[PDB]
């Protein structure tokens, strides 16, 4: 059983039952975010961000409240800087909203920009508290524009994180099986992690039914892009009243998903080795995860290597069970690679930086087989 890594045995890395409402003191922030599709189109979003007061973060006591306040402020920032999403970029964030978002981001050890942990892990709720977690029974908390498939893009992303929750709980079982030298306990525990990663691929299939190719490329992808190496903000975003210099921060990508790196590290796949772009990007995106997940990924690399344990015993039965988890990963990297073609490459032709990246993390996964 995992410790104070804020990993839930039911939903995994996602926030378990996230809050929907801040205290009534923060009605100004909750109002702008809950009506984002209308204020962006009406042109008064950026006005209502300017006619704001500099509120205090101190009223955010419990954990679930600060995450939402990062979630509400993260969406406003992406909506403010990008506007309707056609070129009118605001290279300055106003102080009455820049310094409260930077205070809370420094609080949660997160960057002051919308990340995967905000719009996926803490951005959901159950329609019926008695009916189980499925797409038809769950809904998002915030969106960008009308018909952007942000419900489908985020809930399907979240749905696969819940399938991995049934595999992360097996990690302590594997690590103590190696310590106690119990082979059968390790063989089944490896088979179980593989099997849950097999079920997680079927959850990935749902993305076609709830997300549209060009509705994602044109509407949602524009607001999720950040300002690190982005040409529209050559130096980044100035946080007025917090940093005198413009600060470069990466946007949101699947690399910030903790299950992305969770099993690469466990199975001994040195995805962060070498000076490659994928190995550097996977290490840089750890700073964009919650602090509890930064240390959980850290604790796995500290624990003994599971790969060398199987490669040493000369046990073909263990070699086949371990190879099943690697094959389950390749099946996901090969499906994730397919989704990017239908959703980025072909829309972009009426783009390839994510393509060349995701081919390398899969290529490394195939080279791990025995
Ligand atoms: C639906 C897609 C998405 O990119 N969602 C998204 C993007 C940006 C933002 Cl900001 C928020 C959500 C994909 C989901 C599940 C993915 N995944 C998790 N563990 C994986 C292990 C693997 F081997 C693998 F190949 C993919 C794996 C990550 C994203």
């Amino acid at each position: 059983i995992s410790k104070e890594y804020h990993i839930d045995e039911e939903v995994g890395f996602a926030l378990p039952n996230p809050q929907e409402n801040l205290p009534d003191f923060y009605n100004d922030w909750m109002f702008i975010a809950k009506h984002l599709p209308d204020l962006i189109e009406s042109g008064q979003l950026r006005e209502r961000v300017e006619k704001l007061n500099m509120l205090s973060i101190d009223h955010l006591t419990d954990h679930k409240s600060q995450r939402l306040a990062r979630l509400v402020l993260g969406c406003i920032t992406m909506a403010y800087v990008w506007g309707k999403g056609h070129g009118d970029v605001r290279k300055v964030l106003p102080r009455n909203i820049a310094v409260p978002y930077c205070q809370l981001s420094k609080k949660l050890e997160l960057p002051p920009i919308l990340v995967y942990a905000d719009c996926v892990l803490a951005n959901w709720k159950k329609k019926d508290p008695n009916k189980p977690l499925t797409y038809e029974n769950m809904d998002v908390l915030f969106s960008f524009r009308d018909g952007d498939c942000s419900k489908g893009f985020f809930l399907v992303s979240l749905l696969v994180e819940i399938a991995a929750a049934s595999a992360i709980k097996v990690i302590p079982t594997v690590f103590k099986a190696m310590q106690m030298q119990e082979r059968d306990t390790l063989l089944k525990a490896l088979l179980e992690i593989a099997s849950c990663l097999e079920k997680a691929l079927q959850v990935f299939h749902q993305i076609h039914d709830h997300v549209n190719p060009k509705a994602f490329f044109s509407v949602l992808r524009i607001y999720l892009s950040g300002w690190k190496g982005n040409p529209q903000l050559s130096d980044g975003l100035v946080y007025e009243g917090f940093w005198e210099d413009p600060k470069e921060f990466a946007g949101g990508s699947a690399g910030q998903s903790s299950v992305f790196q969770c099993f690469d590290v466990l199975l001994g796949i040195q995805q962060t080795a070498g000076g490659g772009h994928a190995a550097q990007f996977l290490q840089d995106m750890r700073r964009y995860m919650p602090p509890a997940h930064r240390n959980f990924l850290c604790s796995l690399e500290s624990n003994p290597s599971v790969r060398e344990f199987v490669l040493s015993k000369g046990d073909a039965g263990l070699r086949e069970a371990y190879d099943a988890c690697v094959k389950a990963l390749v099946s996901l990297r090969s499906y994730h690679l397919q989704i990017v073609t239908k959703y980025i490459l072909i829309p972009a032709s009426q783009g390839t930086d994510l393509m060349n990246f995701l081919k390398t993390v899969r290529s490394t996964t195939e080279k791990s087989l025995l």
Side-chain angles (χ1 to χ4, degrees), residues 152-165:
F153 194 60
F154 292 161
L155 290 179
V156 166
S157 304
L158 166 75
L159 259 178
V160 317
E161 278 256 13
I162 310 164

Side-chain angles (χ1 to χ4, degrees), residues 31 156 241 341 365 367:
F31 163 68
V156 166
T341 78
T365 323
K367 305 225 169 279

Side-chain angles (χ1 to χ4, degrees), residues 37-342:
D38 305 274
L39 296 131
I40 297 177
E41 200 275 330
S42 313
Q44 43 174 339
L45 159 84
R46 324 150 190 81
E47 188 202 355
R48 263 167 219 197
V49 177
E50 280 134 20
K51 53 166 171 176
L52 268 165
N53 282 108
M54 179 206 291
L55 272 64
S56 203
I57 283 305
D58 320 326
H59 259 67
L60 310 175
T61 56
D62 55 326
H63 185 224
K64 311 222 213 165
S65 177
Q66 292 142 302
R67 274 287 220 305
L68 181 44
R70 246 199 74 88
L71 175 51
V72 293
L73 283 174
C75 304
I76 302 182
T77 322
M78 314 310 289
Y80 176 89
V81 177
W82 300 107
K84 288 180 194 174
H86 302 303
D88 320 329
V89 191
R90 303 291 220 300
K91 299 176 182 180
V92 186
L93 201 61
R95 178 195 289 103
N96 43 18
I97 205 187
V99 317
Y101 187 42
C102 287
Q103 281 171 39
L104 187 67
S105 288
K106 180 57 183 180
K107 192 151 199 168
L108 306 178
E109 317 203 43
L110 281 161
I113 183 165
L114 175 76
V115 306
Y116 183 103
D118 294 315
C119 57
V120 174
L121 301 191
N123 190 21
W124 61 284
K125 59 167 152 69
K126 297 170 65 73
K127 291 176 179 174
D128 197 272
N130 308 321
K131 295 169 109 173
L133 301 175
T134 179
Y135 183 74
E136 297 80 29
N137 190 40
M138 290 181 310
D139 203 353
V140 86
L141 289 185
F142 297 94
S143 276
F144 275 107
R145 298 282 292 273
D146 266 353
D148 53 4
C149 312
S150 55
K151 160 167 184 176
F153 194 60
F154 292 161
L155 290 179
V156 166
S157 304
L158 166 75
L159 259 178
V160 317
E161 278 256 13
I162 310 164
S166 298
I168 309 158
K169 67 181 182 196
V170 185
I171 293 194
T173 303
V174 153
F175 271 146
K176 205 170 180 188
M178 290 171 55
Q179 183 183 64
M180 305 283 92
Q181 276 273 163
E182 292 259 291
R183 181 253 196 184
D184 317 283
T185 310
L186 183 72
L187 213 171
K188 180 192 169 174
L190 285 183
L191 282 167
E192 162 71 3
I193 300 176
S195 203
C196 294
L197 291 176
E198 311 204 0
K199 316 303 161 263
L201 174 50
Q202 300 296 113
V203 185
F204 208 174
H205 283 35
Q206 312 195 17
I207 199 190
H208 285 114
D209 308 1
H210 319 317
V211 172
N212 180 264
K214 295 184 69 68
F216 155 80
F217 173 78
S218 62
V219 196
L220 193 47
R221 197 208 62 161
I222 286 308
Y223 293 112
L224 293 177
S225 64
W227 40 86
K228 194 192 189 92
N230 199 278
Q232 300 175 82
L233 303 90
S234 52
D235 297 302
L237 194 64
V238 285
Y239 298 92
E240 179 207 24
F242 190 86
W243 273 310
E244 311 181 21
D245 311 314
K247 295 297 176 178
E248 258 174 339
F249 273 121
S253 207
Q256 312 177 329
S257 194
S258 318
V259 295
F260 205 85
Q261 307 196 19
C262 158
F263 296 91
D264 275 303
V265 164
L266 164 75
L267 297 170
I269 311 137
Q270 296 146 20
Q271 287 274 11
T272 38
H277 164 242
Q280 182 102 29
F281 172 76
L282 284 181
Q283 186 98 307
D284 291 358
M285 292 293 114
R286 278 178 172 159
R287 292 293 178 180
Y288 289 70
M289 299 186 187
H293 305 346
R294 266 204 313 273
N295 322 331
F296 178 82
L297 287 196
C298 185
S299 168
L300 296 204
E301 267 171 335
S302 290
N303 269 101
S305 171
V306 199
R307 181 185 180 90
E308 258 313 295
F309 192 94
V310 183
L311 267 184
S312 70
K313 297 297 156 141
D315 186 337
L318 277 197
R319 288 207 319 275
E320 277 137 16
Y322 166 93
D323 268 330
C325 310
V326 191
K327 164 68 195 332
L329 290 205
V330 177
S331 290
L332 285 151
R333 319 267 153 162
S334 277
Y335 190 84
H336 192 333
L337 219 38
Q338 290 181 17
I339 304 307
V340 170
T341 78
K342 325 170 173 286

